[PDB]
Amino acid sequence: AAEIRQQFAMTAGSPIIVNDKLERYAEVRTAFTHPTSFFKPNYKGEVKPWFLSAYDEKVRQIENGENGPKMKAKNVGEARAGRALEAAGWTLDINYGNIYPNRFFMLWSGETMTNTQLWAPVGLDRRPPDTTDPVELTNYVKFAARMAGADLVGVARLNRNWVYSEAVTIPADVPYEQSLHKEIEKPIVFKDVPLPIETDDELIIPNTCENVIVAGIAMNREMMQTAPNSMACATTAFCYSRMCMFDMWLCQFIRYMGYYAIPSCNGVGQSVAFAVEAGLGQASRMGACITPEFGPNVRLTKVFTNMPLVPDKPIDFGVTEFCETCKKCARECPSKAITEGPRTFEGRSIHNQSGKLQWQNDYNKCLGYWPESGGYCGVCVAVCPFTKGNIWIHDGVEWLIDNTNITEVWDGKINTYGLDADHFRDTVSFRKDRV
């Protein structure tokens, strides 16, 4: 896997092609939050917040002994178990994605955390850094990242084009039980200040915030292959909580090294663009970052920091050319959300950011399928050739890409965090591949 990555390393420079129309994107425009897409009917035809209508379908499926849309479970007990596993997975995640910045788990300073308080006498977060060498810092922080649950880790300079212009958040003193009903918009701005700070009016990231560290958190292949049914939902959910723990662990490490760190999970900016710039993978037709190790079957989170670091090289292992002819996700998508046409700089709707060259998908169609199916779908991820274990072959001199139920999952292979020992060697790391 390390050989594959070195082989497809490209020269420095963001591979995302942009034009002069590109503007930063307000987070409220995503299909999850925008008022034009937020409300969906349930199976009874009642208009509700999309996730409430989706809950109605989960209840309906459990009652009827189903694991998904038109997918009968072995029995009601099995149906129940899948949704219990899904719901439990989300334990360390707020309101599907931890997007409110500097709230709950996503604090921009460590000062009030119980861990920081307990460790205060050592003064690790107050002491000036003892290492400023970006080479050594990159090795340290990547080692820490792996301890913190990343299966992949990369570094990029922070491209502000992918930072949301405005965040969706809640007022600071609103407790959790009012959060869903009191969501607001708040600008994210860059200023000459020493530390990340939030005011009544603004989320302020310092101009010194040079870098972004991006983590890939691998999902389980067997469970995702059940998309759009419940076990796909469960591997999705568990990985969101793994993302949260990753962000908290790594931000604390960085702070204890004498720098600042901003967590994000699904908030603050666009993870796919950061991941491509940090060399985890390449953008794809479906819109995900496709990695050599996992294809698109991997979640992303990221941490922003002033810690000096060595940016990784972007990687090009031919995804763009492959997606050009493939279109399997587009054909299998249950909502016809994914385009079969060519890449353009023009967004198909409010949910897309115009001004960058990408495949333009209709993401309101995608979200529409979630209440209908009672899950987070994932069919595109499941059917992508890159998701399958072996797409890689060797032609004698260099690596190249090859041209060509749920009861069973519960009774089948599993290992810690859903990782697969058959492939786990692919993410082994020594100093040579960290920096």
The site for ligand SF4 (CB under 6 A) is made up of 284-286, 322-323, 326-329, 333-335, 337-338, 366, 369, 377-380, 383-386
**Nearer to a copy of itself (CB atom), residue 142 or residue 351:** 142
C-alpha count within 13 angstroms, C-beta hemisphere, residue 202:
11
Backbone phi, psi, residue 15, to 5°: -85, -5
Q: What DSSP assignment string belongs to 13-35?
A: S----B-TT-----GGGSTTT-T
Q: Among 88, 172, 184, 193, which residue sits at the site for a copy of itself (rule: CB under 8 A)? A: 88
Among residues 30, 28, 31, which one has the least CA distance to residue 370? 31
> Does residue 146 touch a copy of itself according to CB under 8 A?
yes
> Does residue 122 touch a copy of itself according to CB under 8 A?
yes
Residue 59 interface partner, choices ligand SF4, a copy of itself, none, CB cut-off 5-8 Å depending on type: a copy of itself
**8 Å CB contact between 83 and 230:** yes
> Does residue 160 touch a copy of itself according to CB under 8 A?
no
Residues 36-75 that bind a copy of itself (CB under 8 A): 52, 55-56, 58-59, 62, 75
**Least distance (Å) between residue 349 CB and ligand SF4:** 14
Whole-angstrom distance, CA of residue 334 vs CA of residue 351:
19
3-state secondary structure of 282: strand
> Does residue 117 touch a copy of itself according to CB under 8 A?
yes
Residue type, 398: E
End-to-end CA distance of the chain: 16
Q: Among 32, 108, 249, 369, which residue sits at the site for a copy of itself (rule: CB under 8 A)? A: 249
**Nearer to ligand SF4 (CB atom), residue 259 or residue 386:** 386
Residue 286 interface partner, choices a copy of itself, ligand SF4, none, CB cut-off 5-8 Å depending on type: ligand SF4
DSSP code, position 344 = B
**8 Å CB contact between 182 and 95:** no
Whole-angstrom distance, CA of residue 239 vs CA of residue 217:
7
Angle (CA) 116 122 125, round 5°: 50
Whole-angstrom distance, CA of residue 433 vs CA of residue 139:
9
**Least distance (Å) between residue 131 CB and a copy of itself:** 4
Residue 53 interface partner, choices a copy of itself, ligand SF4, none, CB cut-off 5-8 Å depending on type: none
Q: Among 27, 66, 151, 277, which residue sits at the site for a copy of itself (rule: CB under 8 A)? A: 151
Whole-angstrom distance, CA of residue 303 vs CA of residue 350:
27
**The one segment of 244-252, 326-334, 356-364, 375-383 that binds a copy of itself by CB under 8 A:** 244-252
Q: Among 168, 233, 257, 319, which residue sits at the site for a copy of itself (rule: CB under 8 A)? A: 257
Residues 191-210 that bind a copy of itself (CB under 8 A): none
**8 Å CB contact between 65 and 75:** yes
Whether residue 228 has a cis bond before it, omega within 30° of 0? yes
Sequence-ordered strand ranges (E) for 263-391: 282-283, 289-290, 298-305
> Does residue 421 touch a copy of itself according to CB under 8 A?
yes
Is the alpha carbon torsion for 217, 369, 334, 408 positive or negative? positive
Whole-angstrom distance, CA of residue 222 vs CA of residue 429:
25
**The one segment of 25-33, 242-250, 271-279, 281-289 that binds a copy of itself by CB under 8 A:** 242-250
DSSP code, position 237 = H
Residue 83 interface partner, choices ligand SF4, a copy of itself, none, CB cut-off 5-8 Å depending on type: a copy of itself
Residue 176 interface partner, choices ligand SF4, a copy of itself, none, CB cut-off 5-8 Å depending on type: a copy of itself
Query: Token digits for 252?
Result: 């604390």
**Least distance (Å) between residue 336 CB and a copy of itself:** 28
Residue 158 interface partner, choices a copy of itself, ligand SF4, none, CB cut-off 5-8 Å depending on type: none
**Nearer to a copy of itself (CB atom), residue 36 or residue 132:** 132
**Least distance (Å) between residue 427 CB and ligand SF4:** 21
> Does residue 80 touch a copy of itself according to CB under 8 A?
yes
Residue 148 interface partner, choices a copy of itself, ligand SF4, none, CB cut-off 5-8 Å depending on type: a copy of itself
Whole-angstrom distance, CA of residue 31 vs CA of residue 63:
29
Residue 13 interface partner, choices a copy of itself, ligand SF4, none, CB cut-off 5-8 Å depending on type: none
Q: What DSSP assignment string belongs to 314-341?
A: PB-SSHHHHHHHH-HHHHH-TT--S--S
Whole-angstrom distance, CA of residue 308 vs CA of residue 210:
8
Residue 92 interface partner, choices a copy of itself, ligand SF4, none, CB cut-off 5-8 Å depending on type: a copy of itself
**Least distance (Å) between residue 233 CB and ligand SF4:** 11
Backbone phi, psi, residue 9, to 5°: -60, 135
Q: Among 68, 101, 149, 371, which residue sits at the site for a copy of itself (rule: CB under 8 A)? A: 149
Residue 384 interface partner, choices a copy of itself, ligand SF4, none, CB cut-off 5-8 Å depending on type: ligand SF4
